[PDB]
Design a protein around this ligand. Structure first.
Ligand SMILES: CC(=O)C[C@H](c1ccccc1)c1c(O)c2ccccc2oc1=O
Length: 578
C-alpha cells in the first residue's frame, strides 16, 4: 500500500492538507465543501489501510484512488463539462487528462476579505476550517503552487491571526502581514510555474542545467559530484510536484532537506541557521539561503576548458558530464551572472565544441571561444543599466506605462488584460532590482524577467493569437527574454476599430481603490495603442493626462452618473480627433 506509506511519513495533518491542495488544484471550480467531503472519505480509507495493508484497494496507486474519487463529481459535465471525458479514460493517462486541464487563469471571482472583526471571530471559532479554506482558495487559483511550500505559508498565515487577533488594533497588526504574504505567495507561485513549464515543455535535461547553474552559485564550495547529487534529487521532487504527485513530492522534499543538513559541511556554511528549526521552516530556509562565499584560490576556466588539448576528447567521452562540469565551474565563480546568462554561455560553448571538434585542428578552432562570451555578457548588463536609469527618472507607474506601450506594439494580438498584468509585473522589476549594486543586479533583474515572461507564455498558450509570441516562447527557454527584446512593432497588425463600450468610463470606477484606477487607466492606454499602433509616445501622453482629468472630475460631480454617459461619448469624439 502506498496511501499508507505516505500517511505514516506525513502524518494526519499534512497528509490531509496535501490531499486537499491536490484536489483543489485539479477541480478548481468545485465548491469548498465537496472537496472537504472527498478529502475526508479519502482520509478515512487511508486509516484502514494503515491497519490492514490489503483491505479494500489499499494495494493500488494513489492516482487510481484519487482519480476515481474526483470522478464521483466530475461526471457532472453540467458543472464540469470537458471533465467527464477525463473520467471515461483509463489508468495510463486518465491523469494526464486532468493535468492537461488545469486553468492558469480561472474565471474565479476576485477574493475580497471581510473586516478584521469577522476573520478573527471565524478563525477563533473554528480554526482547521479557517485554514482549510485558505489552502483551498490559493491552491485553486494557483494550480502549480509548490505544494510543500504552500503548507509553510499556511503555518505562517496561522501565526498572523494567532498573534494579531489578540492585539490592541487587529486591523493594524494583520492587514500588513497579510499584505506581505499575498505578494510573497504570488512571487513563489510564479517562480514555480516556470519550473513546471521547463520540465513539461523543455524536458528534464533543461531543468537539470538550470539547477546545476543555480545551485553551483549558491554552493561554490560544493563539489561537482555533490551538486549533481542535489540536482538529481531536486529534479525528481519538482518532477513529482508538477505531475501532481503531491504526497511523494512532499516526502522526497523532506528527505532532501534531511540530507542537506546532515552533510552541511560538505555543501554550504550558511546552512547552520536553517538546520536548527522545524521541518517546514528548515525547507523554506534552505531554498532561500544566500550563496556561500567563493573559494579562495580558484584556477582559471581557460585552463581545462579551452587551453587543454584534451577538450574534444573529454567532450566525446561524456559530453553531458563535461558540459555539466563547465557550467558548474563557470557558475560557481560568477554569482554576478543571471542563471539564464550562464545557460546562454554554456550553450554557446557546446555549439562551438560541436563544429570545432570535427575540424582539421580543433584547438585552433575553439581557441577564442571566450571572445564570443563578451557580447552575451554585456547585452544584459547594458539592458539593465539602461532600464534602471529610466525607472529612476519616471518612477514605477510611468515606467510601467512605458513598457505597456512598448509591449503592445510588439504583440498587438495579445489580450489587453494579459498585456496589462504582464507589463505591470515587468515594471515591478525596477523597484525590485534597480536599487542593487551592479554586482547583484543582473541575476536579480534578468531572472525575474524569465518568470514574468513565462506567464505571458503560459497565459498565451491557452488562446494563441500571435505567432510571434508563440515563436519567442517555444523556440528556446534560455533565449525568451532576448527574443522579445528583439521584437520591435508588428508591421502586419491591422489596427482595431473603436467600440463605444470599450472606452466608456462610468462612475462605478469611482468606488474602486487607487490601484484599480491606474489599472483602468492602463487598460485604456493599451486599447489606444491597439487602435493606433503607429501612434507616438507623444500623443499618448497628452491623452493620458486628459483621462486623469475626466476621473478626478466626474467622480466629484453631483449629477446622476450621467456625466460618464454623456461626457463618455464626448471624450470619444476628442480622442478620434488625435
Ligand atoms: C524556489 C527555490 O529556490 C527552491 C529550490 C530550488 C532550486 C533549484 C531548482 C528548483 C528548486 C530548492 C528546493 O525546491 C528544495 C526542495 C527540497 C529540499 C531542498 C530544496 O532546496 C532548494 O534550494
Amino acid at each position: 500500500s502506498e496511501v499508507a506509506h505516505r500517511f505514516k511519513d506525513l502524518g494526519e495533518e499534512n497528509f490531509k492538507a496535501l490531499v486537499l491542495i491536490a484536489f483543489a488544484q485539479y477541480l478548481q471550480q468545485c465548491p469548498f465543501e465537496d472537496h472537504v467531503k472527498l478529502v475526508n472519505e479519502v482520509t478515512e480509507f487511508a486509516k484502514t489501510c494503515v491497519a490492514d495493508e490489503s483491505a479494500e484497494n489499499c494495494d493500488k496507486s494513489l492516482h487510481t484512488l484519487f482519480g476515481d474519487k474526483l470522478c464521483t463529481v466530475a461526471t457532472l459535465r453540467e458543472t464540469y463539462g470537458e471533465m467527464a471525458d477525463c473520467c471515461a479514460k483509463q489508468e495510463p493517462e486518465r491523469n494526464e487528462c486532468f493535468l492537461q486541464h488545469k486553468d492558469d487563469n480561472p474565471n474565479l471571482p476576485r477574493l475580497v476579505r471581510p473586516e478584521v472583526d469577522v476573520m478573527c471571530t471565524a478563525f477563533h471559532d473554528n480554526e482547521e476550517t479557517f485554514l482549510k479554506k485558505y489552502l483551498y482558495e490559493i491552491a485553486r487559483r494557483h494550480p502549480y503552487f509548490y505544494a510543500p511550500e504552500l503548507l509553510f505559508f499556511a503555518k505562517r498565515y496561522k501565526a498572523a491571526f494567532t498573534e494579531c487577533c489578540q492585539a490592541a488594533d487587529k486591523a493594524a497588526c494583520l492587514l500588513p502581514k497579510l499584505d506581505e504574504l499575498r505578494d510573497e505567495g504570488k512571487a513563489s507561485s510564479a517562480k514555480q510555474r516556470l519550473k513546471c513549464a521547463s520540465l513539461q515543455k523543455f524536458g528534464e535535461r533543461a531543468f537539470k542545467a538550470w539547477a546545476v547553474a543555480r545551485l553551483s552559485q549558491r554552493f561554490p564550495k560544493a563539489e561537482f559530484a555533490e551538486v549533481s547529487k542535489l540536482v538529481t534529487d531536486l529534479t525528481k521532487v519538482h518532477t513529482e510536484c508538477c505531475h501532481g504527485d503531491l504526497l511523494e513530492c512532499a516526502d522526497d522534499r523532506a528527505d532532501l532537506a534531511k540530507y542537506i543538513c546532515e552533510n552541511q559541511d560538505s555543501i554550504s556554511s550558511k546552512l547552520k541557521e536553517c538546520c536548527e528549526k522545524p521541518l517546514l521552516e528548515k525547507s523554506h530556509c534552505i531554498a532561500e539561503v544566500e550563496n556561500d562565499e567563493m573559494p579562495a584560490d580558484l584556477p582559471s576556466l581557460a585552463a581545462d576548458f579551452v587551453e587543454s588539448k584534451d577538450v574534444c576528447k573529454n567532450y566525446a567521452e561524456a559530453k553531458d558530464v563535461f558540459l555539466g562540469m563547465f557550467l558548474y565551474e563557470y557558475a560557481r565563480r560568477h554569482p554576478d551572472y543571471s542563471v539564464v546568462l550562464l545557460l546562454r554561455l554554456a550553450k554557446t560553448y557546446e555549439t562551438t565544441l560541436e563544429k570545432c571538434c570535427a575540424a582539421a585542428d580543433p584547438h585552433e578552432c575553439y581557441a577564442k571561444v571566450f571572445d564570443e562570451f563578451k557580447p552575451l555578457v554585456e547585452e544584459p548588463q547594458n539592458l539593465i543599466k539602461q532600464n534602471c536609469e529610466l525607472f529612476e527618472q519616471l518612477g514605477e507607474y510611468k515606467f510601467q506605462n512605458a513598457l505597456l506601450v512598448r509591449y503592445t506594439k510588439k504583440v498587438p494580438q495579445v489580450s489587453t488584460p494579459t498585456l496589462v498584468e504582464v507589463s505591470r509585473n515587468l515594471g515591478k522589476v525596477g523597484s525590485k532590482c534597480c536599487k542593487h549594486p551592479e554586482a547583484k543586479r543582473m541575476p536579480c533583474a534578468e531572472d525575474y524577467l524569465s518568470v514574468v515572461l513565462n506567464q505571458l507564455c503560459v497565459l498565451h498558450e491557452k488562446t494563441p493569437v500571435s505567432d510571434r509570441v508563440t515563436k519567442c516562447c517555444t523556440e528556446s527557454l534560455v533565449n525568451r527574454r532576448p527574443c522579445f527584446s528583439a521584437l520591435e512593432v508588428d508591421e502586419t497588425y491591422v489596427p482595431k476599430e473603436f467600440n463605444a463600450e470599450t472606452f466608456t468610463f462610468h462612475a462605478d470606477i469611482c468606488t474602486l481603490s487607487e490601484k484599480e484606477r491606474q489599472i483602468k487607466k492602463q487598460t485604456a492606454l493599451v486599447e489606444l495603442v491597439k487602435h493606433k499602433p503607429k501612434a507616438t509616445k507623444e500623443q499618448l501622453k497628452a491623452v493620458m493626462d486628459d483621462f486623469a482629468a475626466f476621473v478626478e472630475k466626474c467622480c466629484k460631480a453631483d449629477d446622476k452618473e450621467t456625466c460618464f454617459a454623456e461626457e463618455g461619448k464626448k471624450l470619444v469624439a476628442a480622442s478620434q480627433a488625435a
